[PDB]
Ligand binder design. Structure first.
Ligand SMILES: CNc1nc(Nc2cn(C(C)(C)C#N)nc2C)ncc1C(F)(F)F
Ligand SMILES: [Cl-]
Ligand SMILES: [Cl-]
Length: 263
């Protein structure tokens, strides 16, 4: 069992490009945390750490601190012992609408927070939405995150990143684009996944027939026919091709389904 000072690395929680995340248990105190390990031999991590140190909100993963030990960086974060939203989505089914609604509220709270400190996540998807012991959602993984507002001045993005089934269509079609509507779009694909247990398209290019079908309002197809009319009216306002016409988070919060009592 590997270790870092007082911590035993006791279980793999993920292993992408950026090394691994380990469940770390302090041998003295028995405190459990998550540790991201990056082998710097294999600028970006300077940025990630700077962003992580800004984050203070109940629906965003907390940063405890980092240790360099040669080429290895250790990033200590809050453990979400519930695991991911990904694992609460039953393929082809989704989850009960009240659970989807609660998670969507928490995801909006997290995203409003990040946007309000001028940070865009840029890869919102169920893999990056983690659950604490009380099933409170946490936005995780700030490795693609970036500043879109500084000194109250917005900067457009030009870098293409994210995950194709979650990316907004402007990110495939425009030289430059606003950060906020991209994160809103991916929230709408997450909501679709939660209510239908299915992603609607490989990517929103109109070389993609499922995306054309949606633009032509063919909601008698999957995944849309699994979704009640109320949450579907919200998805009609989120999954809008023109990012200037797309609903903003203030207006999501006035949506009928958003405010519908459910249990
Ligand atoms: C993957 N990163 C993180 N993971 C957790 N918790 C957690 C993830 N899993 C999955 C299902 C992915 C597995 N294996 N299971 C648990 C208990 N907490 C925090 C992080 C963090 F901070 F590094 F994002
Ligand atoms: Cl699947
Ligand atoms: Cl899914």
């Amino acid at each position: 069992v590997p270790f870092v000072e007082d911590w035993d690395l006791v279980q793999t929680l993920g292993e992408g490009a950026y090394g691994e995340v380990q469940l770390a248990v302090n041998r003295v105190t028995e405190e459990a945390v998550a540790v991201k390990i990056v082998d710097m031999k294999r600028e970006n991590i300077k940025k990630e750490i700077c962003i992580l140190k800004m984050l203070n909100h109940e629906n965003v993963i907390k940063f405890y601190g980092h240790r360099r030990e040669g080429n290895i960086q250790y990033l200590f974060m809050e453990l979400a012992s519930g695991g991911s939203l990904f694992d609460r989505i039953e393929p082809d089914i989704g989850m009960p609408e009240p659970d989807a609604q609660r998670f969507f509220h928490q995801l909006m709270a997290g995203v409003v927070y990040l946007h309000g400190i001028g940070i865009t996540h840029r890869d919102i998807k169920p893999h990056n939405l983690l659950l604490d012991e009380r099933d409170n959602l946490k936005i995780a993984d700030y490795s693609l995150a970036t500043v879109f507002r500084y000194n109250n001045r917005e900067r457009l993005l030009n870098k293409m990143c994210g995950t194709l089934p979650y990316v907004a269509p402007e990110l495939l079609k425009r030289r430059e684009f606003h950060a906020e509507p991209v994160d809103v779009w991916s929230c709408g694909i997450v909501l679709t996944a939660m209510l239908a247990g299915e992603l609607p398209w490989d990517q929103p290019s109109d070389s993609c027939q499922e995306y054309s079908d949606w633009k032509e309002k063919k909601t008698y197809l999957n995944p849309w026919k699994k979704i009640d009319s109320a949450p579907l009216a919200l998805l009609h306002k989120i999954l809008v091709e023109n990012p200037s016409a797309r609903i903003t988070i203030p207006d999501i919060k006035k949506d009928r389904w958003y405010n519908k009592p459910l249990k």
